[PDB]
Every structure is written in structure tokens, then in C-alpha cells.
Amino acid sequence: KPFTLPVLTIGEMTNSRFPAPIDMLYTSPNGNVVVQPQNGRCTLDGELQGSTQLVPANVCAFRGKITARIVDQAAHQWHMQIDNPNGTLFDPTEDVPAPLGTPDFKAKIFGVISQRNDYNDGSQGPANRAHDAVVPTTSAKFTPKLGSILVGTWENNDIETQPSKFTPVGLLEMNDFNQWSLPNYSGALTLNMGLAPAVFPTFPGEQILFFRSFIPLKGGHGNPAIDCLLPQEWIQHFYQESAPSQTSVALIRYVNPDTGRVLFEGKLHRQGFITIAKSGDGPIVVPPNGYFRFDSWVNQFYSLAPM
Numbered sequence: 001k002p003f004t005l006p007v008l009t010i011g012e013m014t015n016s017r018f019p020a021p022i023d024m025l026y027t028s029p030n031g032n033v034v035v036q037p038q039n040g041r042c043t044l045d046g047e048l049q050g051s052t053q054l055v056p057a058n059v060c061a062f063r064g065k066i067t068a069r070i071v072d073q074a075a076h077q078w079h080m081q082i083d084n085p086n087g088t089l090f091d092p093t094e095d096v097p098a099p100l101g102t103p104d105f106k107a108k109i110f111g112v113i114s115q116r117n118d119y120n121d122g123s124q125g126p127a128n129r130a131h132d133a134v135v136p137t138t139s140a141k142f143t144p145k146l147g148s149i150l151v152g153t154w155e156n157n158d159i160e161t162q163p164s165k166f167t168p169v170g171l172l173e174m175n176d177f178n179q180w181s182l183p184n185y186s187g188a189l190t191l192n193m194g195l196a197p198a199v200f201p202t203f204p205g206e207q208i209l210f211f212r213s214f215i216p217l218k219g220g221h222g223n224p225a226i227d228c229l230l231p232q233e234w235i236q237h238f239y240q241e242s243a244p245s246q247t248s249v250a251l252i253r254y255v256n257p258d259t260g261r262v263l264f265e266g267k268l269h270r271q272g273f274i275t276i277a278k279s280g281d282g283p284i285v286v287p288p289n290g291y292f293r294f295d296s297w298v299n300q301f302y303s304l305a306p307m
């Protein structure tokens with residue numbers, strides 16, 4: 001069964017690590033950083049890894065129920081028991097780091113917590129409320145592997161012990177934001193388990209190619225970005241196809257359909273990430289209609305043309 005890529009321009013792709021369209025291609029040496037995201041992870045033959053699931057709306061979202069105020073915190077802080085972001089119960093026994101779609105980076109994540117009561121007020125139906133909220137993945141009480149997280153709100157009174165959804169919007173602040181720093185999915189207890197492995201180039205002169213989205217920031221200065229190894233569409237595609245990988249590397253070419261010419265080439269590794277022959281930190285300048293084309297199976301030590 002032949003391996004394929006979907007035919008998509010970068011304006012038609014979705015970030016697999018934060019709910020946002022892809023804004024640009026991006027590359028970096030990432031010298032003293034371990035690139036090990038848990039969302040957006042899928043082998044070329046369709047094996048999901050880490051905390052990766054299929055629905056873009058579930059990425060960095062939470063669903064569950066607020067059960068109490070955080071102990072010894074009389075204001076602004078809520079204990080939220082979480083399920084899988086698709087309402088299904090969460091089994092901590094499974095070899096995953098967290099409920100699928102849980103954020104895979106340290107940050108104060110800004111969004112909205114919304115509640116629909118699970119009972120009716122007479123003929124009117126259930127009551128509702130929604131407020132600005134923060135999920136600090138840096139908190140010791142961020143323990144999604146154990147089924148609970150801390151949620152902070154500016155509202156201190158209008159929150160009930162009721163079914164709750166967290167819709168992510170962006171970052172609250174730049175402080176403690178590191179997109180390559182994995183959260184302690186079990187807080188101060190044990191360590192992280194079920195992880196997708198770190199990815200890195202193994203051939204000299206190569207760097208990882210990222211699909212980058214710039215995400216909102218509630219205050220302060222900065223231009224925070226989320227890089228993913230694979231767009232969500234490729235993950236959904238590989239999962240459907242499950243095409244066997246003939247080698248460890250698929251040779252892909254970025255093609256301009258207007259001129260028909262190849263602009264650059266990259267190595268799509270079996271583990272689900274791209275390397276290119278390029279040095280430096282910055283965007284890859286590309287035309288609007290360009291797309292990736294799968295051309296050949298090659299070896300781990302294939303030499304790419306420098307770009």
C-alpha cells in the first residue's frame with residue numbers, strides 16, 4: 001500500500017499542538033533544547049504517540065468538572081477533575097502521559113472556562129456561565145495524568161461544582177513559557193510516562209523543519225509561537241492510511257505548482273518529523289500555493305540539497 005501525503009498549502013494546514021492555522025515554515029538549530037512534543041506525534045505508518053489524538057478542537061482543551069476550590073486557597077483557584085476532552089472517562093492505566101490533547105508545554109495558558117449545569121431550572125433548562133481562566137501547566141497541581149488540574153479565574157464567586165469546559169485562547173504571559181519544556185503530567189509525584197521520544201537530526205548539516213503558528217498573548221510584550229513537527233492533517237491522513245514505511249526516511253519536495261519547479265527538499269522521518277539541509281534560525285520563505293510532494297523512499301544517510 002503506497003504512502004501518500006495530502007495535497008495542502010500551508011494556508012490549509014492546522015497546528016497539531018495548539019488550535020490555530022499554520023502561519024509559516026520555520027527552522028532552528030535548537031542547540032541546548034530537547035525537542036520532545038507529545039501532541040502532534042504520529043509515525044508515517046499511522047501510529048499515534050504521546051498524547052496525540054485526531055480532533056483539532058481537543059488540542060489544549062479540557063473537559064470535566066470543577067469539584068472544589070483549591071485546598072488552602074480561598075480565592076480565584078479551582079480544582080478541576082478532567083476526563084478525556086471528548087467526554088469519555090480517562091483511564092490512568094493506559095500508557096499515555098495525560099488525557100489525549102492535554103497541553104505538552106509549560107505555560108500559563110489563557111482561555112475561557114464555561115459551565116452548563118447538569119440539571120434544569122424548571123422549564124427554562126440548565127443555567128450557564130463562562131469566565132476568563134488560566135491553566136498553569138507549571139503548577140504543582142497540574143496533574144492531568146492523575147485526572148485533575150488547577151484552574152484560575154478572575155471571577156471569585158460565579159463558579160459552581162458543575163460540568164466545565166476550558167476553551168484555550170493563548171498565553172496569559174510570557175513568564176515561564178517554554179514550548180519545549182514538558183509539563184510534569186503527574187505534578188510532584190513520580191515522573192512522566194508513555195512519552196513519545198525526542199526527535200533530532202542525525203545527519204550533519206541538517207535541522208528540523210517546523211510548522212509554526214503565532215498564538216495570542218493576553219498581556220505584555222512578545223510574539224510567542226508554537227512549532228509542531230507535523231500538521232494535524234498529516235496525522236489524520238497517516239492514521240487513516242497506515243501505509244507501511246518502506247525505509248526510515250521519505251524524501252519530500254516542496255513544489256511551486258505555478259512554475260512546477262522544486263523549491264527545496266526534506267527528509268520525512270519514520271518517527272514523524274522533517275529535517276532539511278539548512279543552517280540558521282528563521283522562517284522558510286515560500287510561495288502561497290506551494291505544497292509538499294512525496295517522491296521517494298531513501299536511507300537515513302541520504303544527502304539533501306542545501307537550501
Ligand SMILES: C[C@H](CCC(=O)NCC(=O)O)[C@H]1CC[C@H]2[C@@H]3[C@H](O)C[C@@H]4C[C@H](O)CC[C@]4(C)[C@H]3CC[C@]12C
Nearest residue numbers: 076077108133134136138139140141151152153154
Ligand atoms: C496558582 C497558579 C499557579 C502558581 C504557580 O505557578 N506555582 C505555584 C504552584 O505550584 O501551584 C496561578 C498562576 C497564574 C495565576 C492567575 C494569573 O496571575 C491571572 C489572575 C490574576 C488575578 O489577580 C488573580 C486571578 C488570576 C486568574 C491568577 C490565579 C492564580 C494563578 C492561576
